[PDB]
């Protein structure tokens, strides 16, 4: 909104701002390992205590 002046000025009309904001994209990651000795026994089925 604007204020109306009584004095002689070059007066401002109805201003309106259109502002946009864009998203960030953060790509978080790690790199864990798993030994092959602990994957062959995982996809097998034993019969021994």
């Amino acid at each position: 909104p604007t204020i109306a002046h009584g004095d002689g000025r070059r007066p401002s009309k109805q201003r309106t701002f259109i502002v946009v904001k864009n998203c960030h994209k953060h790509h978080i990651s790690t790199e864990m390992e798993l030994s092959m000795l602990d994957l062959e026994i995982l996809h097998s089925i034993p019969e021994t205590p």
């Binding site: 790509h27 798993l34 092959m36 994957l39 062959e40 995982l42 996809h43 019969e47």
Partner: protein, 319 residues
Amino acid sequence: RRRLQRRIAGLLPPPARRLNISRGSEFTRDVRGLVEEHAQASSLSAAAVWRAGLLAPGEVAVAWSGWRPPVFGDFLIHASSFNNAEATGTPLFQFKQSDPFSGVDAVFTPLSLFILMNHGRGLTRMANLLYDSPATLADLVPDFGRLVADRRFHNFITPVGPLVENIKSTYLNKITTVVHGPVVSKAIPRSTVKVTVPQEAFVDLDAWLSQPCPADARLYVALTYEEAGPRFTFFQSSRGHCQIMNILRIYYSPSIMHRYAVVQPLHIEELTFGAVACLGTFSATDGWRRSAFNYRGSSLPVVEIDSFYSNVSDWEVIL
């Protein structure tokens, strides 16, 4: 010996090489079990991990098939030495730095590899538009003039294959590249990746000659030594390495006598006319579809080799 039958039942059946379909409209579960390949990425739950079968040893199997998983080269580079506006599938070149311990390597796109050759003396407009200053690249090679002068620039640059992952860090960039194997992007929507080589640096060699059509048409990168500074050209051929050095000597036949006529090789080390190296294979049918690479200002033509199997080789000298 009865558990042996259960172990061999777990071990025997390969994926079906043939399957008698009746109609394509029915889409039976047998032909779905044929055509399905296990994935490589899934959500972080027990059901998704067990369904994609990532935990199977060696190769993926839910609870060998002619597919090889790729290997990834992990490279740390300075953020100034690389342009983050590069495409994904572009072949890079690690330069072997001369320090004993570095930590930070030095890679080069063929756009960035052009401006090491340009200074001291289209494609060059885009190259100078991407990287503003060559001096921030011409110190990565510490002694470029000597190394070009004694013709030992081919053994200090080894190819590394195309890029797949480029995180946009601020000081020290980490890029990932496929040094060997099936080039496929590591994105959560798994999208394909096309090896991009700029057009003026990529001259075809099948159509340069102008009937037995093979499948694997290799892509050869070629460093040559010119009086106008060295050049990095790219050659696509459907032939053997034995064929490729003969036909590349025939292709460079004017340039060798050009370099000989303007400069006499006064010493013994200036005889080598650079070297070549096989960058890997791709399909000879739908190879090298032409496309464009747009920066913010300009656009150069660039070839787009699709479905590349990267496989580097050592340098074979041209003479």
